[PDB]
Amino acid sequence: EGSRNQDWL
Amino acid sequence: IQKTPQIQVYSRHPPENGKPNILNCYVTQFHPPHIEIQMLKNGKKIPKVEMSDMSFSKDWSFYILAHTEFTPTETDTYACRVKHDSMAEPKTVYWDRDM
Amino acid sequence: GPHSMRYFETAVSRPGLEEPRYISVGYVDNKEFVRFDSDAENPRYEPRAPWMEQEGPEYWERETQKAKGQEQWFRVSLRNLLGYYNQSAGGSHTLQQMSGCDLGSDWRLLRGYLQFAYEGRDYIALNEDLKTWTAADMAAQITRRKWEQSGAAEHYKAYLEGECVEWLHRYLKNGNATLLRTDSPKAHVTHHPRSKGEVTLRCWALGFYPADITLTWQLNGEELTQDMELVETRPAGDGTFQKWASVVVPLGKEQNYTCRVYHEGLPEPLTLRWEP
């Protein structure tokens, strides 16, 4: 199952 | 910097003149991922060429397998031709049944 | 042996009123098991291993939904990066991400990964401690500062330590033996006369799986890793792989030389000499 990135780069 | 593709051309099974086989063109280690690959029979574009999906390596590099059905003969030559931003001219690599 | 799960994500921006192409590939024990491509007919996560049929439509809902969000994330990130590097409109740019799990053979977590690349060069990575960031370029600093500000590492650490591990545990039992496959190599040496009293000995290994393998040539117990030729290991197209390694030696004295092949699925290395 994939992860959800948090704050953008 | 962009990365210059490495190319190998070889058949799936051991070559035997007259015997149907699969020809692979494996291209690796390139960036950016946009690339154009053609497989050639006696200088002419082979139609119906299986092309795997975009993939990359643990070192961030991209690679692709191209393959087509084929029958090696004594006089037919086969080749892979690749165009990619990292190279002025397209590169052609000739199948070599020993390599 | 140990086990792993990875998701390799890519967003590629190309000039236009265009949207970046977002591609996400899942891997369990290095074998592609799921995939999502934003240039698809019907953009969704597709199974790539047979044992993933087992998962019902609800799974695919979540994951593809999860994908659409990542797709946005990459799109914004891609724009910020253009700023950070002072790149002007009209470029071809690429942003990559690897994240995931390593388990020992006790299925106990061994290590999480989270790293990014821009233009195919390391940009930022979560450190093994899963709370500090390594940032390559000067431009990566501002991301680091920002993510240290928001405590991003705690968000990933939760995922890498929890869900990633559990789901991998789940995939492992559904995949079971399937991804335990090994096909051992078959080896021979082809004998190629040279000029100048020589012969080129080529050691071949065919039909093996996984790709990992080592081939060596030995003159008298000594290991000639010295001016032999290799090729990058190559896929056959059929699920197996091939490789070869050559040395150049005096013919007539071919018993002197010996090739060895090392592969998981071998009871023991293969020793072989050119057979007249």
Side-chain angles (χ1 to χ4, degrees):
Chain A
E1 145 181 327
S3 47
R4 319 146 201 165
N5 292 359
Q6 195 213 236
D7 183 31
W8 347 90
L9 281 182
Chain B
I1 218 69
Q2 30 203 20
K3 305 175 201 151
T4 304
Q6 305 311 95
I7 294 153
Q8 287 190 260
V9 174
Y10 57 85
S11 58
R12 171 170 312 164
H13 301 98
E16 289 231 330
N17 283 342
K19 300 329 204 302
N21 199 326
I22 312 294
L23 188 65
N24 298 311
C25 171
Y26 192 42
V27 189
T28 61
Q29 306 262 283
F30 54 90
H31 194 275
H34 179 71
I35 193 163
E36 205 161 351
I37 301 155
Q38 304 180 55
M39 307 192 67
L40 302 197
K41 179 179 178 179
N42 290 326
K44 272 153 50 59
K45 225 217 70 181
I46 306 167
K48 308 289 85 199
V49 165
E50 298 286 278
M51 194 81 65
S52 75
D53 296 315
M54 173 187 300
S55 268
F56 76 82
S57 281
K58 291 130 271 73
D59 67 20
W60 301 123
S61 218
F62 293 89
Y63 65 92
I64 291 268
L65 179 53
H67 72 288
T68 198
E69 233 142 315
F70 92 130
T71 295
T73 57
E74 197 169 14
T75 56
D76 281 312
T77 76
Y78 293 92
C80 195
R81 203 178 83 106
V82 178
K83 292 185 194 187
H84 184 262
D85 282 354
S86 67
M87 307 172 93
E89 283 99 330
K91 181 157 186 52
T92 292
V93 176
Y94 287 91
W95 179 46
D96 173 341
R97 80 179 63 210
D98 280 347
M99 302 280 295
Chain C
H3 294 102
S4 48
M5 171 151 85
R6 294 278 184 291
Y7 276 84
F8 279 16
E9 283 153 288
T10 311
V12 177
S13 81
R14 281 152 102 10
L17 224 200
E18 263 292 60
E19 285 297 69
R21 189 183 177 181
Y22 173 83
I23 298 162
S24 174
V25 189
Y27 296 98
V28 167
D29 291 349
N30 301 308
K31 176 71 337 215
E32 170 172 2
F33 82 107
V34 307
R35 174 169 213 136
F36 166 112
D37 184 331
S38 81
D39 270 12
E41 26 266 53
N42 202 34
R44 97 161 187 119
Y45 261 115
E46 305 289 352
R48 312 296 284 191
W51 50 271
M52 281 278 143
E53 317 301 1
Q54 269 196 201
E55 231 71 34
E58 219 176 49
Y59 179 92
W60 308 103
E61 292 289 39
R62 271 70 176 121
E63 292 303 299
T64 140
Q65 213 45 219
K66 204 183 303 180
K68 303 263 196 162
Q70 283 295 83
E71 182 167 14
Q72 280 322 108
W73 195 98
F74 269 73
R75 188 186 193 261
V76 175
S77 297
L78 226 16
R79 219 180 317 120
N80 306 355
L81 285 162
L82 218 47
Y84 303 159
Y85 286 92
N86 193 224
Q87 290 165 139
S88 289
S92 219
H93 307 303
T94 102
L95 170 66
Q96 292 163 268
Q97 175 177 359
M98 291 180 294
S99 69
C101 270
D102 286 347
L103 311 183
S105 41
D106 59 0
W107 294 32
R108 188 62 184 154
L109 169 71
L110 210 26
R111 197 203 168 118
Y113 292 86
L114 204 266
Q115 43 196 315
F116 293 85
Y118 188 58
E119 319 300 29
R121 291 166 175 169
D122 288 317
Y123 179 77
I124 200 177
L126 192 61
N127 300 300
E128 191 156 344
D129 51 75
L130 269 48
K131 62 221 335 190
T132 46
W133 298 101
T134 290
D137 296 1
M138 321 289 336
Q141 307 313 319
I142 99 287
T143 308
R144 178 163 74 19
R145 212 93 50 181
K146 190 161 85 195
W147 283 9
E148 275 163 358
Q149 213 80 334
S150 84
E154 283 95 293
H155 171 78
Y156 295 117
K157 170 162 146 55
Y159 162 71
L160 292 173
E161 260 156 7
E163 308 77 310
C164 179
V165 173
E166 315 183 42
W167 284 101
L168 179 67
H169 283 165
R170 172 169 209 174
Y171 303 141
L172 283 178
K173 38 200 159 190
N174 297 358
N176 190 55
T178 311
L179 33 79
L180 264 42
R181 250 219 304 146
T182 75
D183 310 75
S184 336
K186 279 171 226 61
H188 62 292
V189 17
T190 57
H191 182 84
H192 299 232
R194 296 214 126 208
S195 43
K196 312 141 105 291
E198 339 225 77
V199 59
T200 262
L201 298 197
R202 181 110 68 210
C203 198
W204 290 86
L206 304 169
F208 57 91
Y209 178 83
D212 308 81
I213 201 163
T214 301
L215 307 170
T216 59
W217 272 111
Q218 263 170 210
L219 167 51
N220 219 76
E222 164 145 6
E223 179 154 317
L224 272 64
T225 323
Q226 161 62 22
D227 249 43
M228 60 149 75
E229 212 209 310
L230 247 86
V231 292
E232 180 172 14
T233 288
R234 49 160 108 129
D238 61 6
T240 66
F241 282 89
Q242 352 172 128
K243 187 170 209 85
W244 61 257
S246 72
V247 287
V248 218
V249 302
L251 74 312
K253 280 202 148 201
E254 299 95 359
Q255 319 85 32
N256 284 354
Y257 289 72
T258 152
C259 172
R260 279 172 172 94
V261 186
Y262 301 73
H263 193 267
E264 284 166 44
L266 255 30
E268 46 186 303
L270 290 174
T271 328
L272 57 161
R273 281 180 296 114
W274 170 69
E275 311 197 5

